[PDB]
Design a protein around this ligand. Structure first.
Ligand SMILES: Nc1ncnc2c1ncn2[C@@H]1O[C@H](COP(=O)(O)OP(=O)(O)O)[C@@H](O)[C@H]1O
Ligand SMILES: Nc1ncnc2c1ncn2[C@@H]1O[C@H](COP(=O)(O)OP(=O)(O)O)[C@@H](O)[C@H]1O
Ligand SMILES: Nc1ncnc2c1ncn2[C@@H]1O[C@H](COP(=O)(O)OP(=O)(O)O)[C@@H](O)[C@H]1O
Ligand SMILES: Nc1ncnc2c1ncn2[C@@H]1O[C@H](COP(=O)(O)OP(=O)(O)O)[C@@H](O)[C@H]1O
Ligand SMILES: Nc1ncnc2c1ncn2[C@@H]1O[C@H](COP(=O)(O)OP(=O)(O)O)[C@@H](O)[C@H]1O
Ligand SMILES: [Mg+2]
Ligand SMILES: [Mg+2]
Ligand SMILES: [Mg+2]
Ligand SMILES: [Mg+2]
Ligand SMILES: [Mg+2]
Lengths: 370, 370, 370, 370, 370
């Protein structure tokens, strides 16, 4: 069987081709102790990865090796891949081909380093690197649609028509889940709550995933939150302290549609999707309007599909049928797509084997790369 | 039964001899993908022909193998004939004789290549190549008349008297439907509408076929369009956008009567018909005036028969009876004529069989050729 | 009943003996197609005769089998006789005796070929060949007179006295209707009108028969035409074009009296008649002067009898009574005479039967031949 | 000195009497701009004449004021005469008598308009209009011969004997160089070459003058061209494109001997010359056979004298000596003859002066007119 | 003196007629603050134009009022014209006539709005709107040539012959400098460089103008860049960071010759120029080949003239002399031409005065408009 590994900026999803869900989903973090050990006989490791770093985060500094979809620390990336293969999946990487994923418009050194590490450090027999938007389209059983994938690092709108990608129409919004976490940390100071460490950043991400939602009309929701108090929710911190948040619940996700809240000049995700559709030929825009596919963890806010539908309907001509496809499993769509791709009989010929890599080099790794 | 195939520059009309209408009418286009395919398992063919190329035109480059009645790409012409025989008519070309059509004054290599392809690629038992104007005269049940056939590539005026052709009086105007489509594309830029790709050219051809008409008096119509706004019509693009056109509606067909709008030096279709009549003997001009037969898709503009009548009446002596015959089925007249010709008992002896072609060669294909 | 057939260079007049007018009068022409037929199922014959050749003359080359009274094409002459017997009179030539006509001083091979064709091709029971001038004298009920017969091919003056012909006084002027048609074609170029084809020659003959007349005094008429414009007439061509002719109207017939207009050296018809009278014995000239009989289509110009009277009065002694007999039916006089001759009880013994022709041969055909 | 101006349908030849060659030979064309001028300060004239119209023909519509020897536009004819006098010869027309030329059997309004324009627009002191065939006979130093002059507009056969013209034997064939140019344009479409504009007509005329020739035996030459490829020649178009022509080289001039190629009913130039000789008296035919003089630019095809000799020898009795006189300067024979005529002391009394024209009018201009 | 204002999509060039260079050349941008001002007493304007917007671009959003040659914001266009007249030229627009420029095939509402604004907002006495290609031809001292003008918005090929425009042969390529800037931004992400804001777009345009060049052979240059490292150049960002670019230097301008790099279907600038030449009459193509004039800032890449020469030589017949005219001042050619045009004595009559505009309206503004 083949291994499917979706490495995002925030979470790593690993599993076996043919399955319907990732077997191992864990934070893509490396934690290192920031205090001196004083007790003899303690199994104090030098670093912690994933959930073990998340459970000991009180005495650790946590670092993401991937930032804005770009690997900034390849040693920590190798640590995370080692943890994936040996601790999470508990398999030998030299026995299975590995399907990895990457975002469009990424540096070529990224894919080249991934291939070099997979072939020289883990000694995988075969290997492939697929584009995440194409996999998200595989997961929904479509060959036409514009995929809006927003994870932890970056957001991308990729239009595909009848299996053909339109790379000139691909748009990138450098704003995703981690920026929303930082913005929530910033606006929680207005209520006197102070989160500053990396562990507190993990706490704020938990708050965001539990309590934040997308308002259908932002100004009406602001007026509602200012008038009464029915939007206030409570959250218990790990030390038993209880915080209460009101309009922040919908002010954090609103930065997805108004990036000026983050001091950014770019347009929201709705205008990004619309502009990506408008860069395509006039004859495919109608099919793209009816197949707008949401993907990633940042699209999991309650009410984001309705808000997206409303905004794109406001931007598009009135005769177009705007249809936002937001499946309940869209947090794993990429991985699911990868699974579907790695189980196709037609795909079993596109693996880059180790012999081809030894005889050609890093130039052969760019297969269906856009 | 015999197969009747009218191959024009724009449309292919195919059917069986004895029928009253073509069974398969489709655009004479070949579409090829201009983007890279990124999805595995998609039935991405190398090329598309006819309506399948028209439905996928968003990701295709469209090419006409025939330009100005001249085949510029014989491989694409064979693709179109294959699509005609196997996908549209769904017959075996080695079982039926084939009646093909050609315009007068065409290169002889055209007919020779057509015969070679029909006898060596499709292995047709018998084959004939008829002149399109004679077929258009068959369709109207006449033996005397001047046929003005204007399709997509070229316009021809062919006078025939009592079944005798006057080849010295045949006139050719290198201006037809595709030139009018290009001119409409050009003059739509005056309103800020930009159509540049081949798919947008198909869109503009649709606009032309739906909204354009021939003004009886051009300057009066221009004054009317400049004064009020009752001539303005709206058209919805495939992406839901709505464009509005005014005088363009009658400025595009006006190039048929004033080719100087296209930068051409030739005379209009009315003066071409009149000059073709005036090259004939004085004793047949009266019968030619009363039997001016319009044929082809470019004669399907509303008001072209009345304008033609008015112009030729202005050119001819006042005692002559100008009568423009414009049947409602004149878009298929050629094909209909071919049908009538291929069902005649007197014609069943004019088929060029494969034995005659093998024993003689390309010299035998010129039968009743003018 | 007997058949009377007057074969002239221009017209064939056929009918039954005893009638007062020819039943079938048609042009003595054979038309052959000069273009290629392109339509299947058309009744395109190989040749056309008479009025059917005249109606289709736009696509035909027209040929007269008789030129200057001499048959130049005996196959076309047989075609014309076949058309006469089967299409015009609609009789069986093997049931009726045939009275044919010939001009005086004609080659003997002409009469011999006529007899051979009538007896071997049409199998007529009896046959006779009469002289046209004697028949013209029969038509006027006279036995004395000088007949001036001018048809399409040749003009002849034949004096007859008390039923006796004076063959030594017979004069021939090789100038008749067809020469006048050619001269009218030539002088119409002075006004910019161009007639060149055989069909246009038929048009010019129609113009001549409708508009030309004989001026009583030629120089006075020329001065009148040069001064004012009251002599100008208009004529509508078959294609609706209108031409205007002035002095040509009387310049074309003037060549009958001044053959030098045609580059001919001979004398006019008046001097020819006078010289023919002066070759006769002095005792019969007075009776010849009073019985000058005009005959043929070329004597049908308005004012030719008055001009003839004036000229012959100027040539003859002042005591002679010049009387020009010009009956209104003199275009058919020959035929009428033939009718009268074929209904005489005294003539029913002069028929050359087929038995006499088989037992004697071509030598018996010269009966009353001069 | 006197001015000699030969105005043909195609070329104007102007010079001074006494010279041996025309000083100014230029195309008889008027060119008018068919596009709008967009640059300020350009010397954009309203019309161009002659070689200046030929050099700017890319942006001009070219018109011949003379068509088939008939002036269809007298304003353009005056433009051409003005260009002749002031730009080409650079003389004052009010100081020299002018000898003009005309074809036989031309409308009288032509000569009258020429005289009116020469006396009222250019104020010439004296003026004469000579027949072109008589001048061509002057150029060869003969008083007996049949001149076959074929230029751009019309062909004429004029027999002259001992200085006497036989106007009744003059024949006109409405087929010359321009018809051959149009026929070459038509038959070049069989090889896919398309020439349609007036500038392209000038290009085709250049092709005809460079590459066309008369085949001695037409069917043998057709067989030779069909078998091998030694008759193929190449020609470089003004834009650098190279066309190749084969049998067309001798199929275009063959229309001079087989006018049915042009859909014409008339006989070839050989049969026209023979028929013109046969209309003359029997005593001068022997001298006419030995003095057949070719004249004009259309007689400049290589091999036309030999073909003419062969055809007329086939038509004439075997005891006659057929001699075709084709001098190498026969393109200018008319002009040369005019020069010789305008330098004769006996001719200095035949000038029509302006006083005679004022006292008599247009009636005096017909001097030796036939 | 007259004012000459060349308003392009990217730069505005303003000056006085008679000068040899524009006095004021500044970016055609309007910048608006995207942050809130917090300091009292700061001269914080509402908007910035030109160089003042370029110097403060760190806190501004920059907008081009012209996009693809089409004015999308007329208020910002008026702001730019006001900045031109009062801040750059420092003149009163009500004292000088203004010569403006426009691209061919532009919407008529563009010229009408320009005239309305110049006559009602700035109250100019006279005004004219010239075509930019004609001005570029004025600047080179020619009346014949095909101008290929590529600026920031659109590329146009306009052939002119002897001062006559051939509007039917004008071609438009919707691809110019701004598309190349966007493509450079896109391909700089392959090296990990991220430029997303409008200020960063200005930075990338600076990089393009400093480091990009046209490779003579693209594949050989790609092989050279892949092998060694001699093509790598460095560029210092405004914050002191240094980026290094290699093949991008010639991959960005290569989109001018291979628009498929941008996902466009159109042909390159070389094929566009060749097709524009081939739409002209055959007689002017030779002069157009020798006078191909480059114009605009997008033609300022090193090596574009040699590449253009090579490509057009490959497309044209081998006997043609391809000559690319690329003067060193071709970035201002249009303006220079305008200067030359506004100083001509012949032009001082083509100004549209305010009285004519008040008495006629927007219909009079179309003078020499094509
Ligand atoms: N229910 C939820 N609501 C809002 N955001 C969520 C939810 N679940 C996950 N996220 C956010 O999704 C982001 C990463 O999700 P994922 O699609 O795995 O991204 P990546 O592929 O970059 O790892 C995180 O920033 C996380 O905060
Ligand atoms: N209703 C219509 N009005 C105007 N033009 C039409 C109409 N229908 C078809 N056409 C034009 O007719 C042209 C081709 O018609 P057709 O006679 O099939 O030509 P061909 O024989 O060359 O294929 C096309 O350019 C199309 O735009
Ligand atoms: N009304 C008329 N006026 C002048 N000529 C006429 C008239 N009718 C007939 N003709 C001429 O008479 C000629 C032939 O008449 P016809 O006596 O039948 O001759 P033929 O006996 O040779 O056939 C024709 O050339 C025709 O032009
Ligand atoms: N060398 C040549 N071969 C064939 N045709 C020629 C040649 N030179 C000239 N011509 C033809 O001669 C014609 C006109 O010649 P010219 O005698 O000047 O006629 P015109 O007197 O009517 O001007 C033109 O149509 C031209 O094509
Ligand atoms: N040296 C250079 N090399 C390449 N491109 C240049 C250079 N200088 C200017 N440009 C480009 O030219 C474009 C605009 O130039 P210009 O001719 O002024 O256009 P416009 O007339 O539309 O303002 C800009 O996109 C700019 O990037
Ligand atoms: Mg992801
Ligand atoms: Mg057709
Ligand atoms: Mg008779
Ligand atoms: Mg001549
Ligand atoms: Mg510009």
């Amino acid at each position: 069987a083949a291994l499917v590994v979706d490495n995002g900026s925030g979470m790593c999803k690993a599993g076996f081709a043919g399955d319907d869900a990732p077997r191992a989903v864990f934070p893509s973090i490396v934690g290192r102790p920031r205090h001196q050990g004083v007790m003899v006989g303690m199994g104090q490791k030098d670093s912690y990865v994933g959930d073990e770093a998340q459970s000991k985060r009180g005495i650790l500094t946590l670092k993401y090796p991937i930032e804005h979809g770009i690997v900034t620390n390849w040693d920590d990336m190798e640590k995370i891949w080692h943890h994936t293969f040996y601790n999470e999946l508990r398999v030998a990487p030299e026995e299975h081909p590995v399907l990895l994923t990457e975002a469009p418009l990424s540096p070529k050194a990224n894919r080249e380093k991934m291939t070099q590490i997979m072939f020289e450090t883990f000694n995988t027999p075969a290997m492939y690197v697929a584009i995440q938007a194409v996999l998200s389209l595989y997961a929904s059983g479509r060959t036409t649609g514009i995929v809006m994938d927003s994870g932890d690092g970056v957001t991308h709108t990729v239009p595909i028509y009848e299996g053909y990608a339109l790379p000139h129409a691909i748009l990138r919004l450098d704003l995703a889940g981690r920026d929303l976490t930082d913005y929530l940390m910033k606006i929680l100071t207005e209520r006197g709550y102070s989160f500053t460490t990396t562990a507190e950043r993990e706490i704020v991400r938990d708050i965001k995933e539990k309590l934040c939602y997308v308002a259908l009309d932002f100004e009406q929701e602001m007026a509602t939150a200012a008038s009464s108090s029915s939007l206030e929710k409570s959250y218990e911190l790990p030390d038993g302290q209880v915080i209460t948040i009101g309009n922040e619940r919908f002010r954090c996700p609103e930065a997805l549609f108004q990036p000026s809240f983050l001091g950014m000049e770019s347009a929201g995700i709705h205008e990004t999707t619309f502009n990506s559709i408008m860069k395509c030929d006039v004859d495919i825009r109608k099919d793209l309007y009816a197949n707008t596919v949401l993907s990633g963890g940042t699209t999991m806010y309650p009410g984001i599909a309705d808000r997206m539908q409303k905004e794109i309907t406001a931007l598009a001509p009135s005769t177009m049928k705007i249809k936002i496809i937001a499946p309940p499993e869209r947090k794993y769509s990429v991985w699911i797509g990868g699974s579907i791709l790695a189980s196709l009989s037609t795909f079993q010929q596109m693996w880059i084997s180790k012999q081809e890599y030894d005889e050609s080099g890093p130039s052969i790794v760019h297969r269906k790369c856009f």
